[PDB]
Amino acid sequence: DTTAREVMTPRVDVVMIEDTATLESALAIFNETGFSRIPVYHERIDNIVGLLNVKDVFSAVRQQTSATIRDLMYEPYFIPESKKIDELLKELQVKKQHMAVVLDEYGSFAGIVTVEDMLEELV
Template sequence: MWLADALMRLAGSGAGHESISEAQLRSLVAASRMIDGEERRIIDEVLAAGARHVREVMVPRTDVVFLDTALPLAAADSLTRTARYSRFPVIDGSHDDVVGFVHLRDLLIRPEPDGTGTVGELAREIKRLPAGKRILSALSEMRREGHHLAVVVDEYGGTAGIVTLEDLIEELIGEITDEYDVAPDPAPADGAMPAEVDGRLNLADFAELTGIELPAGPYETVAGFLMARLGRLPGVGDETHLDSWRLVVVAVEGRRVARVALMAPAAGGRIALD
């Protein structure tokens, strides 16, 4: 309870408390005799995750299933039954004009499922979050207001993606999986370098998984790094070098880099940066 209160104060959302800085919280943790080594490690991870922004954990708009307000309910039924999601943003003609969302049960469990209505008739209010909002602050705000889904808005007012309460919580406590989640990439044995990674992997997770820190830039993911380095849309077989590693595009979905292979160069040398 003490930690939860301190974290909410760090996010500036503790009722009746003034916010505290991360340095102050770390000092409190260091001075406490009630927190053991493992608990300190967890707190460090929470603080590190809390420093990230919503744009780093959101589902990008290219991976979101949108439903148009004019879509007949019968058509929406068949579309959503095959999806792995339970909540769907509702748009009015454009992905940048999100007017609400519908839950799967709204579509499948209706008093009179005659199929003559439209998705827009069932749309609920949806929350909006700026892409640059901190994770801890966003989590606190969504919990306080009772929202499970939010549209992430970029600096131009367009839709960058969506984020769920589960996405934010997972950044603090680790992955929450259920029977509908896609199985994550297996962790390499004994800390070995993975052969491939998902192109959507954000920079912090990539560094944690591989030990390779990609240079900061106008991107949040491995795919974004490759696009910036190449200066164009990557294709299968495109590659770039980073220190002694080659990052090679091995799969593309549409215009997005789906999988990236990590390859060490042949013995006998170090490859310079491009």
């Protein structure tokens, strides 16, 4: 009966980027941290508007273009803190997505849960 909040990486520890940032800044963030996916926020940290994959950023430099983070980002899968991870694991598998964004009772950013977070429970 484990829930998302029990395995999530909390907001305070999440590497993020603003949708106004450049792709060069995003590449620097990806390189320094090593993560493959970083949430994208608009104005406020609690306003998650997308996720940014390092792949899409590297492939866009294809060729140098007018690509903005808002164009390369994709919609996240938002879930409540009470979501049971046995359901989340199957749901992420159907979507072929690695990361879900956890929201609190106010609909604000609480943290993230990846498949690796859920599998960490099983040793």
